[PDB]
Amino acid sequence: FMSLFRAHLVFYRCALNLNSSYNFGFLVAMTFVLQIITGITLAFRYTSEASCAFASVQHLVREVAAGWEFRMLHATTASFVFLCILIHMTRGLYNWSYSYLTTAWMSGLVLYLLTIATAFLGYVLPWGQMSFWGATVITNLLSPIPYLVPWLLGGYYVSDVTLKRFFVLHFILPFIGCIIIVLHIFYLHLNGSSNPAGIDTALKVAFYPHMLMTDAKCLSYLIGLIFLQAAFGLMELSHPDNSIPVNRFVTPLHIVPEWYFLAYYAVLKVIPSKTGGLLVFMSSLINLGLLSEIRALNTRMLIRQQFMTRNVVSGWVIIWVYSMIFLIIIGSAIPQATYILYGRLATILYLTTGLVLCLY
Amino acid sequence: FMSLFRAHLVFYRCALNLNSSYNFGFLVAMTFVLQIITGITLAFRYTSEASCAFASVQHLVREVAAGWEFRMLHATTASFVFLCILIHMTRGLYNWSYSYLTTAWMSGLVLYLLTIATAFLGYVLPWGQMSFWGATVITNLLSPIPYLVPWLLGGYYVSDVTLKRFFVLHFILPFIGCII
Amino acid sequence: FCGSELLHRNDDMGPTAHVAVGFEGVPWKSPDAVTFMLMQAIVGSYRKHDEGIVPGKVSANATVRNVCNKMTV
Amino acid sequence: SVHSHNIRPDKHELPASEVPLYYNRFDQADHPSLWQLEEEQQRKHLDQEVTDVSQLVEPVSSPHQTEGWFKRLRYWHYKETAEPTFPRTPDLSKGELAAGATVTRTSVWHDPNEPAIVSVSRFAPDNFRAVGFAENVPNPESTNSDSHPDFREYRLGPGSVDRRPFVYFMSASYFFITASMMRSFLCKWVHYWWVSRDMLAAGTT
Amino acid sequence: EKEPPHPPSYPFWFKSLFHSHDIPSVRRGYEVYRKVCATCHSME
Amino acid sequence: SYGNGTVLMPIVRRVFIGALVGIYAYAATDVVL
Amino acid sequence: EPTADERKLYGLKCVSAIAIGTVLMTLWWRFYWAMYATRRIDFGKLKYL
Amino acid sequence: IRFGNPWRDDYPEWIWKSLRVSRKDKDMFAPF
Amino acid sequence: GAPKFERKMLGSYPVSPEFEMVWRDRLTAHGGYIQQTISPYQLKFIYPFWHTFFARCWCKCSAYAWPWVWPGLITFGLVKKMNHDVEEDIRDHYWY
Amino acid sequence: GAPKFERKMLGSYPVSPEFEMVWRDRLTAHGGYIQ
Amino acid sequence: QFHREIGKLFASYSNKITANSPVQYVPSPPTKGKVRRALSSALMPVWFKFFRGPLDRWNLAVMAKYLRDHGLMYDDLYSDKEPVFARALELLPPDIQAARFRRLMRGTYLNHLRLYLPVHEQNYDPFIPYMAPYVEEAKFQLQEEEELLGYHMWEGVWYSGGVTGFGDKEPGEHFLVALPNLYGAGGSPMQA
Amino acid sequence: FLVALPNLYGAGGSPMQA
Amino acid sequence: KLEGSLLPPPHIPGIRRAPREPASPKMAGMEGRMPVRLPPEGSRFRQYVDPRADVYFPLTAVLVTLGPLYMFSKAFF
Ligand SMILES: CCCCCCCCCCCCCCCCCC(=O)OC[C@H](COP(=O)([O-])OCC(O)COP(=O)([O-])OC[C@@H](COC(=O)CCCCCCCCCCCCCCCCC)OC(=O)CCCCCCCCCCCCCCCCC)OC(=O)CCCCCCCCCCCCCCCCC
Ligand SMILES: CCCCCCCCCCCCCCCCCC(=O)OC[C@H](COP(=O)([O-])OCC(O)COP(=O)([O-])OC[C@@H](COC(=O)CCCCCCCCCCCCCCCCC)OC(=O)CCCCCCCCCCCCCCCCC)OC(=O)CCCCCCCCCCCCCCCCC
Ligand SMILES: CCCCCCCCCCCCCCCCCC(=O)OC[C@H](COP(=O)([O-])OCC(O)COP(=O)([O-])OC[C@@H](COC(=O)CCCCCCCCCCCCCCCCC)OC(=O)CCCCCCCCCCCCCCCCC)OC(=O)CCCCCCCCCCCCCCCCC
Ligand SMILES: CCCCCCCCCCCCCCCCCC(=O)OC[C@H](COP(=O)([O-])OCC(O)COP(=O)([O-])OC[C@@H](COC(=O)CCCCCCCCCCCCCCCCC)OC(=O)CCCCCCCCCCCCCCCCC)OC(=O)CCCCCCCCCCCCCCCCC
Ligand SMILES: CCCCCCCCCCCCCCCCCC(=O)OC[C@H](COP(=O)([O-])OCC[N+](C)(C)C)OC(=O)CCCCCCCCCCCCCCCCC
Ligand code: HEM
Ligand code: HEM
Ligand code: HEM
Ligand code: HEM
Ligand SMILES: [Mg+2]
């Protein structure tokens, strides 16, 4: 396999005008590696038994040498997984990368859904108040689908049997993801990568050493920022209620999931209908997938350069980004008629921008 | 990968005088598959906590639908893994297969050691008398090697911490075997 | 001595490329000049259309042997 | 390749033989060798000296073209719309282009005072060139601009100090820092594997 | 309901990157727990 | 088109479009009409 | 969390070391960036040496 | 205003001058 | 990779496996060129970055102004107007 | 596979990937046969 | 014979199209309806003056300044991964192909440095359509091939000869035909 | 093994046909 | 003399020349800006264009899009 290693990581030729916007695929991969290493290590001392799960995490931190380091690194790195993915996806929408890298885009979307499901499974394991009540709610939005809920839990409620099986699934899915990363890379190197200017060019150079040293430089920043946040606690990435034991007969005063799920949780909150809110979920994913066939939606021949430079009409991806930020604020607020009004305003922009990306 | 599938499982040419002595490599592979399927299924309801491990196996058999089938299939198939391997190795020694299939023989020996270690880890999990006292003894024969014992257990005796880590290793090693 | 490259790319002059590489050497009167003469002979030379009676694949010169056996052609 | 073309009929994007989008004025040479004379007798804008953005040449193309709801970009050239059985005949007197289906399925190439074999020899794509070709299209002499620096400004020449010792002390320092980071992470993993603080105390009695 | 008010920022020594706990004050707070709070609250 | 084996993506395109036309038509009849 | 002091003292040693290595890797990257950023390519004829 | 404006953008004259500065054959760190 | 009419090779030696991706993207140098490169051991490699700093910074910041900053200021303003109407709506319903 | 002096092919058509193992064990039918 | 009845319906609709097909060029009918072409003309003097007009003019200024900063033409922005444009590039004469090669090299270098060209190197019109004659001939060649050879969904042998069997001709371009060999040194399809 | 799988794309080839 | 970026073509036997538009008058509001052409003389677009509106476009664009949405949202949502 060493001829494959040198063909794809040493002698592979790349355009000279690459920059840091093309380095975040490597960073995501490295976050998976770090999670697998720290995750397996945590598994040696975790207990899936509901009556003792919450206690096994605390005892791990308070009694075991270096136990605090593996617990806090696993929690912090999870946040960096989703930040890197977000920047990774936004580059593609800025450069219309899916125009000719079609199966790379689709394979990526599957990886995104796999990572969402993995993170949701992991957040239930510590078995605090937010673990229990967040799983109860998010698993009810899927109630319109018949009998899709009572079986995944194996009971009449998020009981102790659900926790045992969420542990096994959480263990397994990341390694399946590693298989799909191989397909992702297959579809990319089939066509070759694009560049920031959106042109064909013969001014290319080998990956090693020029481009390999840019990936290495970015890795340093990632490791330093993870350890900075992990060891000092500068930002508030976790909710305090998950430091409280589960109580099935007392709901917390404010239920909100992790930040990387907040925006779409707000969209589903401002739509009163429960069935209409789930249809909105499918339409959004369908729109992202349809971009793989953007060449065929109009007979005019497209170009990769979108001309956002010095342009006062901006671009649709930029307008989406600010609508997402606006909704993260709404999702973190107490329900109030005024918040609901503006939340619906932003939801329209959040959805319309996706649809018009298929037009040109 | 379909050209590899047809090249090695459809058009691959073999001598006409093969017989059943050359069929036990396939059978071993199929036993691994069956163990992975039944093993993962058992893991959905097993508890590594020493104070409740023994009880979780019994409750699995006595209360859960079809729980007896997955428990007894996993235990029986393990015995057939070692019987097939034994017949598989004996054919090689009868025909001096290692004469020219050198790296096939060595790679096989590594697979044999991996399967031995996996089975030993699995037998401690139900946490009965033989689980505890068999691990205590077999882990003392390795006492001549310095400090090779107190760390694998993480304690002064086959305690509750050893059981948690034997579960993770037992989970992982079979998939490494599939690579080899 | 400047370490640098000067290359003329031309795809309209046949399938054969020509290249030369150089190191800084020593002057006539150097106490090490004789050794440079010898090092030149250890690397030696080779022509595909004029090997002689010793086939290049079995030459004693290691450089010739490695070049002639590359990709079996 | 794994990419298909999208040549199909379309009711909103009419065929280029009817709506060209690009500026539809072209000159026509009897033999393409004549373009070499045009390239030496016409003047080029890039040979004049201008100093302010306001003095740059104005394009002959119009900005008003593509229209529609949520259509962000407003100027295009080419399309893959299918051509019909009987396309529109180009008007050569107005400078219109004749190429492809508009040569094969029209009588645009007939000339009363010439044999057909001679007339149609002038309708290959190399025979047409858009107005403004010689005055505008650049042909660079280098990738580098004389207004920008290159290695002549930055090269270390005679009298310079050797850099090898510094380059390898840079790389060695990175590695003894990265080696220490790895050794510490492994030692912490081994500690985690060893007995905990609650069990070490129970053994003391 | 409404959002509760944000509490003020008191200058606790430990809030700095470079600072440790103030042990003399930790000792006195343990007397307060033992003689006042422990009558109704557990720390299991 | 003729000469390539990209044969599933054209099917995915027609299913996705159809699905979108049905979602936004089922919502209008419930809110507007 | 009684492990707060151990956590913070280890972080100072680590974040400072990593930062220094980040500077060194920046220099090593720009070392290779300059050979292609200062490169000259001429079409037709050679201009300058 | 030239900055950010597609109708006027160009470098001011003090940036074109900085690109013309020359330090050929100088090395202040040579003693190191 | 490259188009078929560009991938065609002039030589006949076989493509080695470590070079499979190189030759999948072969491109003909139409017209030719002359290349000059200096060894990195004989170049100043940090000063060039700062020598061109002002020009590079102008180009980048000018490109991003309209498309990113102008929508950001509008989003910031909407965030303030929203928070000003929430407070007034709480007092028109709960305060006496 | 077979020895080099047996693997040598008489034809020139390229070996297809699904047949890689077949031609790694080519053997000449010395003397011929009727089946 | 249920297949012969369906074939009769297809045939009736087919003969109707032919009997109503003209034998010379006829302008296409207006797309938009009369109700839509009346509102637009009534609101045009106000919509065009203050919105659509300045939108068109800003667009062309943004495009022209970006291209000129890099020394590029508009037609340089099209990719050789389009089958039509790839065929057009094969038909070019040497002089036009050489100038495009050079502009693309120079523009990648300028985008890498992020340094503008001087104003006196930007004095040219970037919107000259130098590819048009070759694009229209390419479209004609590929429309013939599709109508004469690609009018039916043909069957084939599956996973044989390096291809999947569903239409691909160049080998090893889909995952289920990846990794053609386990031993050996491989080879290039261009050296068969 | 460390030189197994020479190519990811293409149709491969035989060393006996070089 | 001629509109746009064209110059008088030289007379070369064998090259048929397309007709070229002559230069047209300018309007107020383009001083100091990079030139972009106006619609042709005989055209409805020329009767309605005014380069002075380019300066106000950054605001007009925000109002036609976000304006209606804000008023519709403040009335029914
Ligand atoms: C000394 C005293 C103290 C002071 C000193 C300082 C002290 C502190 C310590 C020292 C700090 C400095 C040390 C030296 C640093 C040297 C290195 C350096 O300069 O680095 C810059 C350098 C820039 O890269 P480059 O190659 O030079 O140029 C790339 C081009 O810019 C790419 O451009 P392109 O044209 O090639 O590509 C097009 C497009 C392609 O797209 C992309 O590349 C991807 C998308 C880019 C945009 C990102 C935003 C979208 C994502 C949103 C995320 C939302 C989060 C959700 C949570 C919200 C919570 C509320 O990208 C863009 O458009 C990029 C431009 C974006 C401009 C954004 C403008 C914002 C305007 C804001 C207006 C606000 C208005 C309201 C104001 C109100 C108040 C008045 O980046 C690096 O080297 C990266 C190193 C680190 C790797 C990442 C690891 C950490 C991951 C987390 C952070 C993620 C963001 C990281 C940046 C990403 C950039 C793409
Ligand atoms: C290798 C060298 C290195 C060393 C050795 C390495 C050794 C390891 C390597 C592996 C060795 C073992 C062999 C593994 C073989 C694996 C199979 C394989 O290779 O197949 C490739 C094969 C491609 O073969 P090919 O030869 O490249 O080309 C085939 C044709 O000849 C030509 O076709 P084409 O080119 O025209 O188009 C092909 C296109 C065709 O594209 C499609 O047909 C679309 C496929 C993706 C659809 C979903 C994406 C999102 C779309 C929007 C949302 C839609 C929602 C549904 C509603 C739709 C409207 C009704 O396919 C792709 O784009 C590829 C995508 C990659 C899929 C891989 C997934 C494998 C199965 C595992 C799935 C696990 C999912 C976990 C995450 C979810 C957990 C909840 O892929 C397939 O065709 C299978 C597609 C399977 C799709 C599964 C989608 C599951 C998720 C659906 C969405 C559910 C959302 C629910 C949300 C609920 C919220 C509460
Ligand atoms: C805020 C945090 C970020 C960092 C600080 C801010 C960033 C700038 C810091 C200053 C560094 C640059 C100094 C000027 C350039 C030096 C190189 C050079 O060519 O200069 C001469 C050159 C002209 O000379 P020439 O005669 O033409 O050519 C001579 C050479 O042969 C030309 O040959 P060459 O071009 O091939 O290169 C010569 C080579 C040779 O250079 C040498 O002379 C060799 C020096 C060997 C040592 C290398 C540095 C290692 C330091 C590591 C830390 C200490 C470790 C020891 C233990 C510490 C224990 C506490 O240069 C180097 O290798 C440069 C070494 C210095 C690297 C930068 C180190 C900064 C951080 C230091 C502390 C560590 C980080 C904190 C963590 C620790 C504490 C918690 O002039 C310039 O390049 C122009 C100078 C103007 C540029 C400076 C602009 C500064 C203001 C902008 C930044 C403002 C703040 C950030 C704003 C953005 C965020 C809001
Ligand atoms: C009793 C109360 C009833 C209330 C309900 C409403 C009742 C309204 C009755 C009105 C009756 C009188 C007016 C009738 C007009 C009829 C027009 C017509 O049918 O077309 C004729 C005619 C059709 O002929 P055509 O041949 O099709 O021509 C089409 C054009 O070619 C088009 O193409 P073009 O190339 O010429 O144009 C360029 C094109 C392309 O331009 C571009 O792409 C450029 C874009 C640049 C954008 C740059 C933005 C940068 C700044 C970003 C700022 C940050 C944002 C992000 C941050 C967010 C943070 C959260 O521009 C556009 O696409 C324009 C976009 C307009 C968007 C407006 C959408 C408003 C939606 C309001 C909500 C509706 C409900 C939603 C759902 C609710 C839940 C169920 O069209 C025209 O001649 C043009 C007329 C255009 C008029 C547009 C504005 C109409 C406004 C009406 C009043 C609305 C009031 C609402 C509030 C009321 C409160 C009480
Ligand atoms: C068996 C491997 C080691 C494991 C045990 C040791 C602990 C491991 C932790 C690191 C220890 C330090 C490394 C050893 C020193 C190496 C020195 C050496 O011989 O190098 C030769 C040289 C030394 O530097 P040099 O090139 O200047 O030396 C030239 C030769 N001299 C000086 C002798 C004339 O290094 C290289 O060739 C560098 C190659 C490029 C690699 C760049 C490194 C950055 C990494 C970026 C990618 C991210 C990696 C993470 C992947 C994760 C995947 C899941
Ligand atoms: C992309 C990969 C992964 C992601 C995104 C992820 C995410 C998470 C998250 C968010 C938590 C909850 C942290 C908390 O709030 O306490 C968690 C916990 C956990 N994860 Fe992971 N994980 C990944 C991989 C793995 C793997 C591969 C394993 C084991 C093989 C693992 C084992 C565990 C365990 C045992 C816990 C419980 C301990 C705890 O909650 O701190 N994880 N994971
Ligand atoms: C585990 C998750 C992922 C990993 C490990 C990963 C990895 C990579 C890597 C290493 C690259 C090449 C380097 C780079 O461009 O950054 C890349 C490119 C790419 N990725 Fe990802 N990716 C992931 C998720 C995604 C997602 C979610 C998408 C889109 C929805 C996506 C779409 C793309 C595209 C289109 C490219 C090519 C960009 C271009 O060349 O223009 N990937 N990916
Ligand atoms: C998981 C364990 C193993 C699996 C799945 C496996 C699989 C196979 C298979 C499928 C074959 C070809 C069919 C056959 O001859 O039966 C084979 C052949 C062979 N195996 Fe195993 N094997 C395993 C363990 C071993 C062991 C333990 C040895 C020796 C210590 C070994 C040595 C050999 C040899 C020498 C051959 C070639 C026999 C011949 O052609 O004469 N294998 N193996
Ligand atoms: C070659 C593969 C395997 C072998 C030889 C093996 C062997 C064994 C043995 C001998 C036992 C003890 C049975 C008893 O006396 O009760 C056991 C138990 C167990 N194994 Fe496996 N195992 C294999 C694979 C796996 C895998 C892949 C998993 C999970 C991913 C797994 C999960 C379990 C569990 C949860 C138990 C405890 C339940 C019980 O003791 O009945 N096993 N295994
Ligand atoms: Mg199209």
Residue numbers in the entry:
A (entry chain A): 9 to 368
B (entry chain a): 9 to 188
C (entry chain D): 292 to 364
D (entry chain c): 160 to 364
E (entry chain B): 156 to 199
F (entry chain L): 53 to 85
G (entry chain B): 350 to 398
H (entry chain i): 33 to 64
Sentences from the paper on this structure:
CIII (cytochrome bc1 complex) plays a crucial role in electron transfer and proton pumping. The pumping of protons into the cristae lumen occurs via the Q-cycle, which involves sequential ubiquinol oxidation and ubiquinone reduction. Both reactions occur in specific quinone binding sites within the cytochrome b (Cyt-b) subunit, called Qo (oxidation) and Qi (reduction), which are essential for catalytic activity. Likewise, in the apicomplexan mETC, complex III2 (CIII) is the primary target for antiparasitic drugs.
To reveal its binding mechanism at high resolution, we affinity-purified the T. gondii CIII embedded in amphipols via the 3xFLAG-tagged Rieske subunit, inhibited by ELQ-300 only, and determined its cryo-EM structure to 1.8 Å resolution. Surprisingly, the C2-symmetric CIII structure contains two bound ELQ-300 molecules per Cyt-b monomer, one at the Qi site and, unexpectedly, another in the central cavity of the Qo channel. In the Qi pocket, ELQ-300 displays an unexpected binding mode, which is well supported by our cryo-EM density. The 4-(1H)-quinolone group is pinned by hydrogen bonds with H197 and D223, interacting with ketone and amino groups of the ligand at N–O distances of 3.0 Å, respectively. Owing to the fixed orientation of the quinolone group in our T. gondii structure, the diarylether group in position-2 extends toward helix D (on the matrix side), which is markedly different from the binding pose observed in the bovine homolog, in which quinolones with both 2- or 3-diaryl-groups extend in the opposite direction, toward helix A (in the lumen side). The peripheral trifluoro-methoxy-phenoxy group displays flexibility and adopts two distinct conformations. Conformer A makes contacts along helix D with I189, V190 and I193, whereas through a rotation around the ether bond, conformer B extends toward helix a to interact with a set of hydrophobic residues. Thus, our structure reveals an unexpected binding mode of the ELQ-300 in the apicomplexan Qi site, which differs markedly from previously determined structures of the inhibited mammalian CIII and provides an accurate molecular model for developing antimalarial inhibitors.
